[PDB]
Amino acid sequence: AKKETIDKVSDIVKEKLALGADVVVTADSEFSKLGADSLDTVEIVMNLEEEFGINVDEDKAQDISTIQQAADVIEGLLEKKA
């Protein structure tokens, strides 16, 4: 996926708890992270769809690999549809 899209996807996660200040951001860094480990797929998916302005189905945002994959999937939605 493109760096621009990857940075955006990773940015969404940080916005969850206000990050990106003194924390390093990576694409290979799975969405999951230590801390509560609560589910935020519904919130996360909407953030990406809301930000990008695409139409991602829940069936597509149910078993998405790390950010790398997320960015790649979005790239298609940005060009395709659903």
Swiss-Prot record:
4'-phosphopantetheine is transferred from CoA to a specific serine of apo-ACP by acpS. This modification is essential for activity because fatty acids are bound in thioester linkage to the sulfhydryl of the prosthetic group. The modification O-(pantetheine 4'-phosphoryl)serine is found at S38. GO terms for molecular function: acyl carrier activity; phosphopantetheine binding. Coiled coil: none annotated. The keyword Chloroplast applies. Keywords: Chloroplast, Fatty acid biosynthesis, Fatty acid metabolism, Lipid biosynthesis, Lipid metabolism, Phosphopantetheine, Phosphoprotein, Plastid, Transit peptide. Residues 3-78 form the Carrier domain. Pathway: Lipid metabolism; fatty acid biosynthesis. It comes from the Eukaryota. GO terms for cellular component: chloroplast. It is found in: Plastid, Chloroplast. Belongs to the acyl carrier protein (ACP) family. Carrier of the growing fatty acid chain in fatty acid biosynthesis. This is Acyl carrier protein 1, chloroplastic. It comes from Spinacia oleracea (Spinach). The lineage of its organism: Eukaryota, Viridiplantae, Streptophyta, Embryophyta, Tracheophyta. The chain holds residues 57 to 138 of 138 of the full protein.
